[PDB]
């Protein structure tokens, strides 16, 4: 569901 991944530089975690 969420966009909780390693990238682009650091980790990014947007609760979609």
Fill in the DSSP letter of residue 7: -
Reduced to 3 states (helix: H, G, I; strand: E, B; else coil), residue 8 is coil
Tokens of 2: 């969420």
What burial letters (b/e) apply to 1-14, b meaning 16+ CB within 10 Å?
A: eeeeeeeeeeeeee
Query: Measured between alpha carbons, how far is 2 from 16 in angstroms, rounded to an integer?
Result: 5
d(CA 7, CA 14): 12
Which experimental technique did the depositors report for determining this structure? NMR
Residue found under tokens 């979609």: 16
The token pair that represents 16 in the structure block: 């979609």
What sign for the dihedral angle of Cα 8, 9, 11, 16? negative
With breaks defined as C to next N over 2.5 Å, after which residues does the chain break?
none
Tokens of 12: 């990014």
Q: What are phi and psi of 10, to 5 degrees?
A: -100, -175
Residue spans of beta strands (DSSP E) within the chain: 3-6, 11-14
């Amino acid at each position: 569901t969420y966009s909780c991944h390693f990238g682009p530089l650091t980790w990014v975690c947007k609760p979609q």
